[PDB]
Every structure is written in C-alpha cells, then in structure tokens.
Amino acid sequence: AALPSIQLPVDYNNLFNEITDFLVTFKQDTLSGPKYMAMLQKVANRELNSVIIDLDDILQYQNEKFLQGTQADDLVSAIQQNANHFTELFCRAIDNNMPLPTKEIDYKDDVLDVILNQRRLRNERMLSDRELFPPNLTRRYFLYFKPLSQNAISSKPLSVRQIKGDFLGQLITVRGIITRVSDVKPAVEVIAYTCDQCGYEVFQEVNSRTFTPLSECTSEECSQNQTKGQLFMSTRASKFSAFQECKIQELSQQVPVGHIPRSLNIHVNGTLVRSLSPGDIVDVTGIFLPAPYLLTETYLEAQFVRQHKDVEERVMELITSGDVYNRLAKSIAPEIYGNLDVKKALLLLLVGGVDKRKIRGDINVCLMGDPGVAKSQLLKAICKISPRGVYTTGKGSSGVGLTAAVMKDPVTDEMILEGGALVLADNGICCIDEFDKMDESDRTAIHEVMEQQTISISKAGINTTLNARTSILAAANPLYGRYNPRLSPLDNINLPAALLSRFDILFLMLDIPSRDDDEKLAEHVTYVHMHNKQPDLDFTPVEPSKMREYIAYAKTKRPVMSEAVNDYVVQAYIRLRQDSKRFSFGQATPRTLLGIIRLSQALAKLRLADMVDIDDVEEALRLVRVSKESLYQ
C-alpha cells in the first residue's frame, strides 16, 4: 500500500535540538543549576517520578532567546498543536541527558537492572567475535505538560461541548464535573517474554488498546541457530504503568436550554492516577485524542489537574477570652432567634460523652412541635458546624438513603454493598429532618443505631452489621399542620413514645401567636434583614472553622469520675423521681440518668477538666429540666 507525502512547516531534528537546549539551560531566573537538570538529579536518585514541564518555562526561555536575538521557533505553539509527539521528544532528550544518581539505591534490587546487566554481559560475550532495550522499559519517570498561565489556548478552560474535532492533537484544558471514576488497573508499557529454549528475553512495546502476543523467539540467539523457541510472558520483567479512566461531564449550569449534558472520557496514567474522584468539579489539562472505534472514539489524556476545592496554640485565643461554652452556644446559627438552651444542648451532642468497657457514649436530641421557626436551617447549620456531620430527612436523601442495602450498579452489571447516611455519620452526627415521616425500615435503622450502633444487612447470602456510632439530631414536626398547645405530644406526633424515650433530651417548641414574643422575634428578624451583620451584639459570634478548633480540642478532653459527681448524680436522679411520682412521658428513667451523665461528661470536656464537676451535673439536669418542662406543655 503506497502512500503520498507532503512537505510541512516543521522539523523535529531542529525542535529536538531546541528541546534539549531548553532542558540543559533553563532556570526560573526571574525569581533570583538548571531547574530541569536539578529535577532530573532528583529523578536519578529515584526520589521523584512525576516530571512536570511548565509551558510558562518554555515561554520564558523563548522570550530569553528572542531577547538575545535568535528565533526559538515557538515551541509553545508546537507543543500546543501536536502535544503527543513532543512527549516522545522530551523523554528522548531526558534519556539522552539525565545525570547519574547521587543517593545510594541498592541498584541490584531492581529486576530491570539485573536483566539488562545480564543482556549486556551476553552482548559482550557476542561482541568479542566468538538499542540494548526499548527505552520505555528503562524509563522510570512519567512526563506531563502543564499549561500556560493567564498572560495561550491551553490556558482557556473549555466546557465539554466546546471540545470540537479540530482540537484533536492539541493540549487543551477542560472544565466540568467528574460523574464516574474507574478503579486503578495496570497496563503494559513493554511486555517482557522469556524464551524457553535459549533464555534470551525479548520485548514488545504496546501502543494501543489491544495487542497480539509473540510466539516464536525473534532473537539472533535463536534465529541464527534456526531454533524455533517459544516465548512466555513475565509480569515480573514487563513494565506496567498505572491506568485509570474518568468520565467528565459539563456543569449543569452550562447546558443550553433543552440539550442533554455532554460528556467525555479522561484517561490518566502513571503517578497522576487517583487525583480525581466522583463529584469533583475540576479543570484538567490534557491531549484531546482519537481512539479506534471513519468515526473515531475520543478521549482526553490527562496531564495536569486543578481541583476547584498551630491549632492547639490557636484554641488558646478563645479559651483566654472566657465564658466559652455560653459564647460558643451563642455562636451556633446566630441568625436564628433565641432558644439558647436548645443550642447549648446541641453543642454537647458534638462534644459527646464517654464510651467505656459496653457503655454507650453518643448524645441525642429531638426537636418537636410546630413547623417553621428556622428549625431546618438549624439542623443544616449543625451539619455545617460539626465535623463528621450529615444532613438527611425522613424521606429525603432518597438515593443511597438513610437506610442501607445491598446494591448493583445497574448502569453496568457488578454488585456491591454500600452504607447509608447512618454509616457516613459514624463517629459523628446525623441530622434527621421530617423525622415524623420516616418509615418502618428507617425507624428500625435508628433503633439499631441506638440499640447496637450499627445498621444490619441480611440479603443475597450476606448477613452483616455495618458500624454506625453516631449522635442523632431530630425534628418531629407534628401532624395536621399545627400542634394543639395544651395536649400530650402523642396526640400530635406520629412517632412511638418508645423511640422518643431513647433520646437524651426532647424539646417541644410551639409557634405561639403572642404580640410581645412576636415583636421580639420580629425585631430580631427585621434587624438581621436591615443591618446585614452581627445578628446580635455581645453574642461574640465565632466563625465555623475557628470554632472547629475548639470543638475538636474539647472532644478529646475525656473526663474521669469524681465521688462528688457520683453522689450528686445519684441525688439528682432521686430528685427528678419525686416529679416522676405520678403527667406526660418525660419520666425519670435510667436512660434519662445516662443522658444527664453524658451531658455532664460533655460539659466536663468543654471545661477541659479531668474531674467531672457537680456543676456539670446540675447544668445537665437544668437542660433536662428545661426539656421536661418544655415537654410538659
């Protein structure tokens, strides 16, 4: 099959010379050996494998040469135009110029050194008249081009649907959301075959999605002896590279009206693997390339990535200022009016009690009563403030759900077991909005959190319990739109009193129309709308990231029992039992006593003490007393 040919305005000999000149000369001299040769000494020490080339370095080198009065033939345009070939040129230049190691390596421990040394010895035995390898085999590093900064096409972040066929071969940059990521798998750069009948190994480089394996020994050792020896693949000696695929999709906002969102395959190789995860919003530089399916399949060979997204001294800045529990509680959602006792309890759920051996240490609160009053925003704010938090609703989060299951990926054919929200909330806190509406499986799921700190599986031959140690924050908004504000909650709420008895505290709150409290609430709301800042004075609202310092710091200040608290909490239980000597389900029980103990331990954590304080017990009892008096309405 004969081919025609044409002359073109390029020369890879001249550009190879330019590339090695750049490599052996350039440094970032505006910041005042060469950057690239020093980096290649790091490669030679086996301390580095990711060789990054900046197009800005190439541009600075071109400008330096042009300033010195010689044309650099705009290597930036060439690499932005036919990027894939210049990977080969850059790697050949490196292989022709990389300096020897400085740090010791124990060089014989690499199989490639032993096998190529043996081939060299055999070739010297031949060479006494009695390439050595394909270079990709010996090439340990991975080479990537990094785009131009703003100052050019590689710099511009294209949406996926702007990637047209004319860009094929160019080092473009794309922008979107990763909708799927592959597990890592190895791919052969060079296959190494042993030869059974002579021991002289032979090599095949692979440069496509498929190949055909070798059979007969092509080496002169066999071929000259006309000895038709058989070849066997060795994974020990074959060079593999890490491979991974990711599907990028344009952002949902970029989709024109009525169009389907367009998507693309990104292939990533070498050390750059597992730089991406699903749900990431990211800019990725790569070579936009065809693949064998006249319509070609197409993908992006990734090259560079831009994701869109001490303390133990710094906590002292808030500790030294004092009254930090009261202030931090007042910092919980300062845009929400009042209810400071509720906020003070919700903080203790993040701080937590003691678990011991078992003794169960999580702390749980239920909000109950009329809808609105910024409650859903408070639960969302808790999910924002708290570390290891998650927000749900009794019917929401309706994908993987709050309740766990065995599952397929029905878009493909494999099966997997995966956890629901209660497992993500493990070692943390789960917020249940619309708590009144959750079903029997959901209710038994939160039962299993409270009764085993797990969620169970009994399906498709798999019996397993997944770990779910987590605090519950919950919102039981009533039936029929409004509570009847003189009745027991069970005349207003769907949920069984059995479930409610497991919570450490319950706050019934009613949306009472009352001119005076209406005006106090309305003054707060209107002031927040008017002033745009400081939702109240003297609250000292701490910002989320700064208070996470103290929440994490407080969480680890585990207490030890004091005999004073042991007596005092026994007395506190007996005092509340006198009130229990009866008109609602807020009775004193061992679980309320445990709630007081855990709330007290969380207060001991917050006051940074080892000895738990009778003050902690009395304040824990105060929150329980306010809770019961709230429940009594």
Binding site: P186, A187, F211, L417, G419, Q452, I462, T464, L466, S501
Partner: protein
C-alpha cells in the same frame, strides 16, 4: 495496606489485605496433569500442565508405534487440582465515605477452597498477580490493561480443665446469672430465666424440641432491651430484630428463589 492503594510495583510481591467476602464461585477444576492415549496402539502417557499450556506429544511415545498426531486427551483420566474465585470487597469502614468501596477477585486453591463464606471479614495473604484478557476468545488478541487478582497462600477470620473447676461451685447459679449482664441492674430472676434459655433442654426423635422461649413484658421505660442486646452478643448464632410492622414473610422467608428471614 489498603485495597485502594495497590499499584504496579506490587504486581509480583506478596501482599496482605483485610476485606469483606461478598460471594464465591463453586469449586472449579484445574488440570494439573494431562492424560494422553494413543488412538493406534492404546499406549498412555502423562503431561504436567506448564503455565496453563498442555505440552501435547506430537508423535506417540512408543518407538515401535511412533505415529504422528495419534495421541488424544482422555479428559476424565487427567488429574485435577481445585480452584475457587471469591469477590473480596473493601470494607465500608475504611472507605473515603463519599464514594464506593472497591473490590478485588482472589483465587484460592486445593483445601483452602471454602475456607470462608459470604459476610466473612477476613485477612488474605497472597501474591498479587495480573493476567491479560482476550478481546475475543476466537483470537490470541489481548487487551492492553491487565486483569488483577491476589493468589492466596493463607487466610484468617476478622479448655475443659477450667470448665470442671467452675462446675463444683455452690454459688454457680447466681455466678453464671450475674455474668450475662453485670452492667445492668441485677434482676436475677430474669437473668436466671435467660441462663436456662441459654442452656436449653434435650430432644427426642420418634414433634417436640429442647427449646426455651421467653417474653420480657413490662414498661417501655426499662432496661430489657439492653438485656436482649447482651444476650444477642452472648449467644453463638442468634439474631436481633423488632416486631412493629414486622411482616409474616419478612421475619421468616421471602421471594427466582426463596431467601431466609431473620427467624430462620
């Protein structure tokens, strides 16, 4: 080291993975020796399989016969090892929780077959391995990215003298009763009844069974649920669930195949 962290350097090394068994194949026969019988002279010879390749004899071994292409494979006189493949999942405990757990296939051999079952959390120690896979079984053509698996060499999950010494004690009824749940209030009639439930009776095949069945009534505001939790931990092969909204088929067995419910 984590399943997510394996990389091309490991590909011939020995590794050790913690994980959850999702499921296993049946036992798969793997030919270790082929058996070749001569169509002409009925002479027989044995060939060890080398790297999955049958080293077929091209001519009959006996020099007094030596006919070419006369040997044929007598399948059920070949000798076979046992192989089994198991799907081992990254545990949901160790994942970065926003995205799925991985899983890896492992090959397990000979008497190590059926050493574990679905739902077992295990360690497996083995060589990491990789193999190519064909683009079409009618062709030698291979896909560039290899399949990977671990080829296991060891597995692990997750006396009477002492018993006789305790058996002579006089407080033994209360001693065993306290031990079931010393963290809960002592309620020792409940704990003694549960202790008898843990002992059980005897059986007779001629129907009756040596079971014991208990119902904890009383208020919802008491510790009985925690007692149940400890007893579920104590028993070798129990289950825990609850009865509100519990279906007659969900509790028992459900629908193609029928799968066992909690009670079964």
């Amino acid at each position: 080291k984590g399943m997510r962290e394996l990389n091309p350097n490991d590909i011939d090394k020995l590794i050790n993975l913690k994980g959850l068994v999702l499921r296993s194949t049946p036992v798969i026969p793997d030919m270790k020796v082929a058996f070749f019988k001569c169509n002409v002279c009925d002479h027989t010879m044995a060939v060890e399989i080398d790297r999955g390749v049958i080293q077929e004899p091209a001519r009959c071994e006996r020099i007094d016969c030596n006919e070419p292409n006369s040997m044929s494979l007598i399948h059920n006189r070949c000798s076979f090892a046992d192989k089994q493949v198991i799907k081992l999942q990254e545990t949901p405990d160790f994942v970065p929780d926003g995205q799925t757990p991985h899983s890896i296939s492992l090959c397990v051999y000979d008497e190590l077959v059926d050493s574990c079952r679905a739902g077992d959390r295990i360690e497996v120690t083995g060589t990491f391995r990789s193999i190519p896979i064909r683009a079409n079984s009618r062709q030698r053509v291979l896909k560039s990215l290899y399949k990977t698996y671990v080829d296991v060499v060891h597995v692990k999950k997750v006396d009477l003298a002492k018993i006789r010494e305790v058996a002579a004690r006089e407080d033994l009824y209360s001693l065993l009763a306290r031990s079931i749940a010393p963290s809960i209030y002592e309620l020792e009639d409940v704990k003694k009844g549960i202790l008898l439930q843990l002992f059980g009776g005897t059986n007779k095949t001629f129907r009756y069974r040596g079971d014991i069945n208990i119902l904890l009534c009383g208020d919802p505001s008491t510790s009985k649920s925690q007692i149940l939790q400890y007893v579920h931990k104590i028993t070798p092969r129990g289950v825990y669930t609850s009865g509100k909204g519990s279906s007659a088929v969900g509790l028992t067995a459900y629908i193609l195949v029928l799968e066992s419910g909690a009670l079964v």
